Amino acid sequence: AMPDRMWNKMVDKTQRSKAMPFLPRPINLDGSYVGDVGFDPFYLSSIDKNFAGFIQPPSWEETNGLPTLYWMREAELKHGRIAMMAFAGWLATDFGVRFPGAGEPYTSVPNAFSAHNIMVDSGAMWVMLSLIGFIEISTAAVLVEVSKGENDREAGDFCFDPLGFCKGKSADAINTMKLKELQNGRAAMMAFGGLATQTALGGVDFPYLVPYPNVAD
Amino acid sequence: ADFSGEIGAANAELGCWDPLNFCTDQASFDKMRYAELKHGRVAQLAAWGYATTWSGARFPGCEDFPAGHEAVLKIGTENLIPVLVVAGALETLWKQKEGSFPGDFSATSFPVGFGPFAKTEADMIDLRTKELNNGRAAMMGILGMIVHEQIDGKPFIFFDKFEIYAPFGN
Amino acid sequence: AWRDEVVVGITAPVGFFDPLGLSKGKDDATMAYYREAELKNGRVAMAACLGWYLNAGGVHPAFNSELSNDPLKAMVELPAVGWLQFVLGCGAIEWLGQQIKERPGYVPGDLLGASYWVDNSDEGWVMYQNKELNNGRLAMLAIVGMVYQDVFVGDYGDMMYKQL
Amino acid sequence: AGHMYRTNWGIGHNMKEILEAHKGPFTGEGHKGLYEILTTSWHAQLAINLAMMGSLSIIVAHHMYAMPPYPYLA
Amino acid sequence: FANGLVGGEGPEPMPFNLVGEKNAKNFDPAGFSERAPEWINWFREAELKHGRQAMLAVVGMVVPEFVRIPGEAFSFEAIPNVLDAHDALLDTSMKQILLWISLMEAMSLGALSNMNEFDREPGNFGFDPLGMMPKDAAKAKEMQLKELKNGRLAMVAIGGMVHGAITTGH
Amino acid sequence: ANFIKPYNDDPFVGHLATPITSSSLTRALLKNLPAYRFGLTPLLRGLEIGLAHGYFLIGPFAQLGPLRNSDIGLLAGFLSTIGLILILTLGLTIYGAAAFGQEKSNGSELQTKKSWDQFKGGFFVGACGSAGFAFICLSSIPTFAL
Ligand SMILES: CC1=C(/C=C/C(C)=C/C=C/C(C)=C/C=C/C=C(C)/C=C/C=C(C)/C=C/C2=C(C)CCCC2(C)C)C(C)(C)CCC1
Numbered sequence: 047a048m049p050d051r052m053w054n055k056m057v058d059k060t061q062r063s064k065a066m067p068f069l070p071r072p073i074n075l076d077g078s079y080v081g082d083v084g085f086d087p088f089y090l091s092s093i094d095k096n097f098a099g100f101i102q103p104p105s106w107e108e109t110n111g112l113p114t115l116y117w118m119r120e121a122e123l124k125h126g127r128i129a130m131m132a133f134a135g136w137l138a139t140d141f142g143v144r145f146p147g148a149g150e151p152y153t154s155v156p157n158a159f160s161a162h163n164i165m166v167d168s169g170a171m172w173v174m175l176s177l178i179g180f181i182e183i184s185t186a187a188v189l190v191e192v193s194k195g196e197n198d199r200e201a202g203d204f205c206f207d208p209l210g211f212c213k214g215k216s217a218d219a220i221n222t223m224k225l226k227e228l229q230n231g232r233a234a235m236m237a238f239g240g241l242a243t244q245t246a247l248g249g250v251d252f253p254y255l256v257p258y259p260n261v262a263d
Numbered sequence: 264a265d266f267s268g269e270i271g272a273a274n275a276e277l278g279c280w281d282p283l284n285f286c287t288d289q290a291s292f293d294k295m296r297y298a299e300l301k302h303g304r305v306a307q308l309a310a311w312g313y314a315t316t317w318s319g320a321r322f323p324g325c326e327d328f329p330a331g332h333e334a335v336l337k338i339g340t341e342n343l344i345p346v347l348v349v350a351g352a353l354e355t356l357w358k359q360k361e362g363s364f365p366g367d368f369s370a371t372s373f374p375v376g377f378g379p380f381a382k383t384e385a386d387m388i389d390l391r392t393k394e395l396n397n398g399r400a401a402m403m404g405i406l407g408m409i410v411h412e413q414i415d416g417k418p419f420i421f422f423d424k425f426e427i428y429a430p431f432g433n
Numbered sequence: 434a435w436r437d438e439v440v441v442g443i444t445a446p447v448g449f450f451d452p453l454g455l456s457k458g459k460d461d462a463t464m465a466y467y468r469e470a471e472l473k474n475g476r477v478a479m480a481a482c483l484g485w486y487l488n489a490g491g492v493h494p495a496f497n498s499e500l501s502n503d504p505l506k507a508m509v510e511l512p513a514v515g516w517l518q519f520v521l522g523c524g525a526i527e528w529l530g531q532q533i534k535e536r537p538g539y540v541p542g543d544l545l546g547a548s549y550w551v552d553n554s555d556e557g558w559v560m561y562q563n564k565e566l567n568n569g570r571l572a573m574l575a576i577v578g579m580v581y582q583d584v585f586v587g588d589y590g591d592m593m594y595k596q597l
Numbered sequence: 598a599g600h601m602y603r604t605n606w607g608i609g610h611n612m613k614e615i616l617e618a619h620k621g622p623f624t625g626e627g628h629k630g631l632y633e634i635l636t637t638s639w640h641a642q643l644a645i646n647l648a649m650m651g652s653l654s655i656i657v658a659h660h661m662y663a664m665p666p667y668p669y670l671a
Numbered sequence: 672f673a674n675g676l677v678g679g680e681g682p683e684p685m686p687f688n689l690v691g692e693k694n695a696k697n698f699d700p701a702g703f704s705e706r707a708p709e710w711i712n713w714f715r716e717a718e719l720k721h722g723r724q725a726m727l728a729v730v731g732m733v734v735p736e737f738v739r740i741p742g743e744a745f746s747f748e749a750i751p752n753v754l755d756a757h758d759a760l761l762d763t764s765m766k767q768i769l770l771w772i773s774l775m776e777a778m779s780l781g782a783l784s785n786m787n788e789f790d791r792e793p794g795n796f797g798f799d800p801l802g803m804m805p806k807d808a809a810k811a812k813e814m815q816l817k818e819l820k821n822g823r824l825a826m827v828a829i830g831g832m833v834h835g836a837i838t839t840g841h
Numbered sequence: 842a843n844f845i846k847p848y849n850d851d852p853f854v855g856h857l858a859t860p861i862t863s864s865s866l867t868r869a870l871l872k873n874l875p876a877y878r879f880g881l882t883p884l885l886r887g888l889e890i891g892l893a894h895g896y897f898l899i900g901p902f903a904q905l906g907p908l909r910n911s912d913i914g915l916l917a918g919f920l921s922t923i924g925l926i927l928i929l930t931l932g933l934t935i936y937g938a939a940a941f942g943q944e945k946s947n948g949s950e951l952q953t954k955k956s957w958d959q960f961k962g963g964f965f966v967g968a969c970g971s972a973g974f975a976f977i978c979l980s981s982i983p984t985f986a987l
């Protein structure tokens with residue numbers, strides 16, 4: 047009606063998306079972040095909300111607010127890293143690899159598709175949860191600091207480079223490297239889906255296919 | 264333009280109720296008015312006929328014919344053709360009076376007009392309005408009846424047929 | 434001009450909505466009739482919706498809950514005396530409404546005469562009025578949908594949110 | 598429920614704000630001014646508290662006979 | 672006339688136009704365009720979409736030989752009537768189809784949300800993989816006109832097709 | 842928005858313009874009631890009021906009176922209603938005498954002796970007749986069944 051539409055504020059009509067020529071370009075995907083092909087059909091990057099409020103209630107204190115892209119990038123990176131890790135583990139477990147010095151519980155496991163249940167029953171999953179939680183809390187606080195505007199860390203930057211693969215490297219090269227991580231991560235995320243749905247419906251194997259003629263569920 | 268003055272306006276406020284703007288100029292209005300009147304007059308007679316027949320009355324030599332639209336389907340076409348011939352003739356006879364409201368056939372060969380029925384201009388307008396209104400009602404009525412006949416067989420919805428009280432006719 | 438003055442009814446999802454342009458050449462009086470009809474049809478729909486929902490739910494504590502839960506079956510079961518009172522009563526209110534309409538300053542749809550205290554300058558007033566209209570518009574469509582379901586599909590209960 | 602009102606950590610509700618916001622077309626300024634009254638008048642507080650306490654006692658009487666709460670009481 | 676949208680301007684004839692010329696030039700008897708100028712863009716987009724879908728529907732109807740498709744469930748031999756397929760594979764294939772159609776359609780909302788303010792040409796989703804659209808505007812418009820004309824034909828075509836079957840052995 | 846304002850814009854009168862007191866509905870209903878309607882003569886005002894009040898009074902007596910279950914219950918109810926109407930009529934007569942006096946002049950002002958007397962007379966006729974109408978109606982009740 048009369049009120050000015052937020053469409054104007056959440057999209058740049060002058061320019062247009064690259065992956066999607068028809069759609070206009072989201073005003074936030076300006077290319078600063080790596081891997082930006084201007085792809086946000088749902089214009090989620092343009093949503094105005096400090097998602098950092100999840101970690102710390104906004105009412106607690108006045109903060110500048112973490113830009114949406116920062117939060118979104120964080121999640122994308124995290125999801126990707128986790129997915130890549132999971133994929134490797136699934137296959138290795140399928141190959142039979144078990145912990146060095148492990149015992150019957152691990153050895154007996156029939157297939158990765160069945161490991162979760164047996165492990166949760168064993169209780170080891172609980173142990174992992176507590177450990178993972180510690181990591182989450184120890185590393186998450188940084189986001190609040192960034193939103194507060196008191197720190198200038200970038201998304202995914204945990205200053206973690208033991209082997210110095212990227213130490214003293216041309217910025218352009220660091221860029222391609224980080225993109226490589228993102229690309230591999232995105233691939234892994236999609237990969238896990240089949241590694242799950244297919245296995246559930248069909249059976250676990252190197253191809254993890256489902257008996258087309260036979261039932262799946 | 265403003266046809267509010269024309270007879271048959273819905274009411275003082277709405278004026279001419281033309282939802283789809285069929286009428287644009289006086290020329291069109293005259294066309295539409297003529298049609299409305301013709302359909303109206305025809306319908307008024309139709310309702311009367313349908314009721315008479317459906318209730319059971321039949322002319323001499325028509326005691327075995329069916330009633331309703333069923334008649335048109337079953338009764339011989341040969342005995343229906345007369346209707347067309349008696350109607351087409353009338354179509355030719357009626358003569359529109361120039362410079363007069365649509366549907367005025369005063370110029371017809373046989374005497375036709377307000378005659379003794381109307382005196383003042385107001386009386387004329389009243390009779391005209393009543394003719395139009397009753398026609399409008401019948402137009403809806405004949406449809407309502409036929410539709411319900413097909414739907415349930417009850418053309419009158421609440422009763423099967425009318426019973427007449429004609430003392431002198433007896 | 435109605436189009437140049439109307440404020441209530443124009444909302445965010447679609448703004449002014451007249452795809453078929455059924456109001457382009459209409460005068461103020463015709464447009465007033467339309468708005469009054471819109472509101473009345475909508476308000477009656479809202480009420481009908483609530484009635485159907487209650488009956489379908491089974492909360493019809495009248496006549497010893499003898500009448501059926503199916504709203505359409507119940508109507509047939511209701512004695513005519515009940516229906517006559519309904520029509521006549523509504524007719525009475527209609528007469529009074531006509532009196533109010535004739536009075537100078539009538540705003541189409543206002544039977545409480547809220548014009549005496551508030552005008553459309555107040556945004557709160559226009560907004561609340563919009564809510565009535567919007568909910569009424571939705572209700573109109575709903576009552577038409579529900580009847581279809583009961584008469585053709587064969588159900589008179591929610592087939593959308595029932596599956597928790 | 599005890600974590601609904603603000604104290605010293607930002608999060609929470611301020612009763613004054615809640616009361617003042619609730620005003621309508623038929624009630625003028627609404628519930629404005631009530632907070633000060635109930636935070637500066639013991640008599641006002643006692644009124645509400647005493648009425649509610651008495652009302653509770655009456656409820657206890659009804660609910661404690663229909664639903665006997667103790668062994669060998671009924 | 673719209674706002675310059677390619678269309679109409681057709682020698683194509685039509686003797687059943689109740690109101691207006693029998694030609695297809697500027698075919699807008701109802702007159703929705705002038706009454707609702709702001710909806711012209713939307714109407715164009717909807718027209719194109721309906722037509723394009725119809726053009727695919729006809730060929731989909733003309734391939735009831737189960738050709739290029741395996742699977743007993745999909746066997747056109749098993750499901751002789753192409754029409755029966757909708758209910759035949761409703762929960763096995765129709766749902767799948769919906770998934771992709773739905774995802775694709777939702778992604779276009781950004782453009783359609785404010786068509787008037789945005790500059791995208793109605794119906795132009797930048798899809799010319801073979802890069803073969805007459806570069807010349809003169810013919811470019813002609814090409815567009817062909818699409819519209821063929822699409823309009825298709826829309827009507829499908830109706831007859833399907834219905835026809837509803838009244839024949841197929 | 843305030844739906845309650847001082848009446849007649851007088852902040853000091855003992856009355857308020859609430860939706861109930863001053864709404865189109867209330868105004869319309871009260872304007873057309875026989876008591877305040879414009880044009881009605883004193884007699885007609887009384888008649889309408891009487892016709893209305895007599896019809897609903899026969900009910901209570903007929904269905905809950907001492908002889909309700911008797912075959913002559915409706916007749917008894919009618920008689921009882923007539924008795925009540927007489928009592929009310931006495932009241933009207935007495936009120937007029939005290940409030941208006943003995944000789945009047947204005948005329949056609951419900952608030953004068955002559956007008957009041959005419960009003961009272963109308964009430965009596967209307968009330969008694971209305972009660973009779975109810976007797977005839979309640980004698981045979983329609984089931985409105987087809
Ligand atoms: C609740 C309500 C309402 C109301 C209701 C009511 C209150 C009713 C009442 C009613 C009434 C209360 C009525 C009455 C009636 C009456 C009548 C109807 C009467 C009649 C009479 C007559 C007709 C006559 C008589 C006579 C005379 C006058 C004398 C001589 C003799 C004779 C008999 C002739 C309404 C619905 C609105 C709405 C809602 C609310």
Ligand SMILES: CC1=C(/C=C/C(C)=C\C=C\C(C)=C\C=C\C=C(C)\C=C\C=C(C)\C=C\C2=C(C)CCCC2(C)C)C(C)(C)CCC1
Pocket residue numbers: 921922924925
């Ligand atoms: C509407 C209205 C109103 C209201 C009212 C009300 C709400 C209530 C009322 C109520 C009432 C007002 C009641 C009454 C009652 C009465 C009674 C209950 C009585 C009874 C009586 C009797 C029982 C008697 C008997 C007898 C006779 C008749 C004769 C002689 C002998 C003896 C004495 C035995 C007002 C006023 C505001 C205003 C106007 C309108």
